């Protein structure tokens, strides 16, 4: 689909067998999510934006599917106030910005 | 352009008559540039992140150029980590999020 950008880009995700909203985020290098419990093995990681940084833990090979669309990659849990789909998944679904 | 999302979206930009590099962010809703001189009148604001809450001067209805499409905006001058177009600008220049 075409998303406009008049409202923020949120979109229906699944991951670890939930179903939750996020933004299709072009300024995040990563994908950051709100806390949840994953299994699995995961690495301490702190990341910086506006204020400051919060620390996150690092999950590598998760299965997330992005609007139908399937990708497997890093993500990053903790407290963040908003679900952000960055751009290491954004390639896989075949994410552009155009204008 | 169409611009693939492999690398950091970043793009020249000229405001205050100046060029600066700037990251194209869906994710912000608001234009956020690290600090410099602008000339006219600006107000004090507060702009919250993933880390937290941070103090900027406010400059409404400045002309900013954007990879060569013009926009006239607001742009918020503070201690961000990095030069954010956001879609208060982004809609200006036309640009969608496509896959
Ligand atoms: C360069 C950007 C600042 C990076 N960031 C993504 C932005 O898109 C951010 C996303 C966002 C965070 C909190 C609340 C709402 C949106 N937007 C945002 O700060 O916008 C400002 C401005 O306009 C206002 O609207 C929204 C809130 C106001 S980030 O999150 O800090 C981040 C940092 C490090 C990683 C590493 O890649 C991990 O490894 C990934 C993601």
Not at 27 to 54: C, S, Y
Not at 63 to 90: F, M, Q, Y
């Amino acid at each position: 689909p075409q998303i406009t950008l008049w409202k923020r880009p949120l979109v229906t995700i699944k991951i670890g067998g939930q179903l939750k909203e996020a933004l299709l985020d072009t300024g995040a290098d990563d994908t950051v999510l709100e806390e949840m419990n994953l299994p699995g093995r995961w690495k301490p990681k702190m990341i910086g934006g506006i204020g400051g940084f919060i620390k996150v833990r690092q999950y590598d090979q998760i299965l997330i599917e992005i609007c139908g669309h399937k990708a497997i990659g890093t993500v990053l849990v903790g407290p963040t106030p908003v679900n952000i789909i960055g751009r290491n998944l954004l390639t896989q679904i075949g994410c552009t910005l155009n204008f």
